[PDB]
């Protein structure tokens, strides 16, 4: 099983960026997708319940497109690497990586 990503992104302050991943080559069903950084939670997409968006990001993150998410009003402090953690039924755990650079 493999994950393909948007690819590393360079954006400017105040811009908007989509972070998306695609799970390929697997017979596994996706129960939940966690969007995270090394130390913080951005959003979770759960198949049974729905989306959860961490209060830190509720002003500038919208669910979608698909199992991805959209960032508004990019700041330089966003510069970092973002993870799309796919939790599949029931073995689980596929991981994708996307670095965003701002200025």
């Amino acid at each position, epitope marked *: 099983g493999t994950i393909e990503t948007t690819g590393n992104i360079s954006a400017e302050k105040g811009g908007s960026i989509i972070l998306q991943c695609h799970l390929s080559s697997t017979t596994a069903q996706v*129960t*939940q997708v*966690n969007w*995270e950084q*090394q*130390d*913080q*939670l951005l959003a*979770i997409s*759960n198949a*049974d*319940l*729905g*989306w*959860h968006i*961490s*209060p*830190s990001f509720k002003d500038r993150v919208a669910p979608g497109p698909g199992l991805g998410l959209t960032l508004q009003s990019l700041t330089v402090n966003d510069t970092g690497e973002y993870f799309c953690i796919y*939790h599949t*039924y*029931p*073995d*689980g*755990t596929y991981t994708g990586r996307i670095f965003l650079e701002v200025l």
Partner: antibody
Amino acid sequence: QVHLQESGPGLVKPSETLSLTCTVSGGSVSSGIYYWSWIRQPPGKGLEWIGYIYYSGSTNYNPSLKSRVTISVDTSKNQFSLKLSSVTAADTAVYYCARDYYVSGNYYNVDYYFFGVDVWGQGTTVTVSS
Amino acid sequence: EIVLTQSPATLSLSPGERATLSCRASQSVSSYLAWYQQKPGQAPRLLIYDASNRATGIPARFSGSGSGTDFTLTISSLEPEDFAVYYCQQRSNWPPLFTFGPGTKVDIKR
């Protein structure tokens, strides 16, 4: 769909220990998404949280009960269990095994438990009596 | 300790009417509150999570609102099968942990 099923005796004598077991269906108790919880409800009263266990074995119990509660997990039987010792009549209740959601320790910006208890068992009534 | 309170303890409304239930916290718990429904003889069902998000598949007449110390579950148009007890649960990291409220019982007027 995940289906949970409680088992264990309905009568437990005073001072002895209550033991229940929850069997998971249509899903794996090893899934890293979930906390496996126990919640009880004495007749005619509200719901009280007992504790949960993660598939790695780590636990978190209700402080008013932690001196007597031990929740355990068996990954190969697809079961997790609750043992409550030195019971009194205050422990008479319907006991639900249920499903909650895991919060990674890596989230510095998450001081809460997201989602909710979305799957419950049927609950079994245990009465503590002589 | 976090102390949860629910009022009214009892509502009595006719089908089609608006029911508003209130949950309150001794101190703030931000959005970290879920709402549960329990009908006679059954286990609770999760309706609302993180204050305002309705669970998938839940009928759309259930909706949650509020923040901090004052929370509200609204059944916008009561159906008779909504006879049940409704509990709030606090979901923060504050000492009592996973505390449920006392509940509000909604009777149906016919």
